[PDB]
Amino acid sequence: VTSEQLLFLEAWRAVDRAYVDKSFNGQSWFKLRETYLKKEPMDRRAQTYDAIRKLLAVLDDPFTRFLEPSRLAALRRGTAGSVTGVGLEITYDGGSGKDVVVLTPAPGGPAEKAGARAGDVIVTVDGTAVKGLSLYDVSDLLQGEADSQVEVVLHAPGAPSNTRTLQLTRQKVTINPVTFTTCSNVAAAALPPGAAKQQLGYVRLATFNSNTTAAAQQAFTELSKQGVAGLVLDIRNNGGGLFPAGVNVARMLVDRGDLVLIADSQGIRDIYSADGNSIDSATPLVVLVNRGTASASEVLAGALKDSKRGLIAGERTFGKGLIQTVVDLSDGSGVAVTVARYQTPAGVDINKIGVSPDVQLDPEVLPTDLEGVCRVLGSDAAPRLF
After folding, report:
1. DSSP string for 141-180
2. The domain that contains 108 carries what CATH number?
3. What residues make up the domain containing 65?
4. Which residues contact 31 (CB under 8 A, 6 or more apart)?
5. Residue 29, exposed/middle/buried by CB under 10 A (0-12, 13-18, 19+)?
6. Which residues are marked as active site?
């Protein structure tokens, strides 16, 4: 057994051990390994990498992928320093044709500023067709040095002819996780039942990252204090991100019960429940979501809806419920494996299904800026949030 073979086996083993579906998409996992060992060329390192990619493809899971050393390393540093993008979060088509779409644009990011919307289909990046490529590869195409440009050709969801060509300039994007305000003189249409004040708390939660928790706790604390009639939690166009920040958030609003189940082919592997650390479990709550709401955000939304803590308003979310873990290989390369999926307290999958609104609304009626939000909420044209 060669060194190349051994390496191959680490990749095979990583999946054999941790993959979400222990039936491997109906393939005999172990047999496969033996077949590949026999039939696949693994003379050179690059051939080993090809045999690994080939092996992974059999699972028909585009999130399960192989990463070469340089890519793995780069993935790690991410978009920290020198490495910039165009403010686009990408993922595969909800019905997946291996089409690469805009999961959600980063607020105030290049692409968002150039009119890009969650759900837009990316056709080419610098003329390169993206269909079917790894998201890891596509991102590489989108990132580059600050001040450099990139051409992105996109079309409207379900409108391949409705395209637009954008020449985006790469720049550091800084998404402020949380902003909040108090809306005064809220139209009666927008108030919860039995409100004794025409005042609503508005919390825009744009991203789940390391700063999310602290900012959110201060916001709910303040709003609770002011005694607003209802809370409006805006998670539209929020790709999710830091899972644990979503769990922290849910904990601030729910006192008791299950928030999220972690499942795979074997059953429930893990559970996150309310810990009695709420900040505000009583004020009427409405959560705004849209097709740009994904992952940890969907987790939050489903927890809030299922528990009956808040109403969901807007449009059905993305349905991005899978979880991947990167397993490092001896030579610095790595495998990204889908290990599990998120389910609501109700045992329903987030994946594919997403979170449905209790209250259907045009997801664009409400702005995201504090001034504008209140404006609309006090207007004659206020949405019937509750």
Report:
1. HH-BSTT-EEEEEEEETTEEEEEEEEEEEPB------EEE
2. 2.30.42.10
3. 1-83+323-337
4. none
5. middle
6. 295, 320
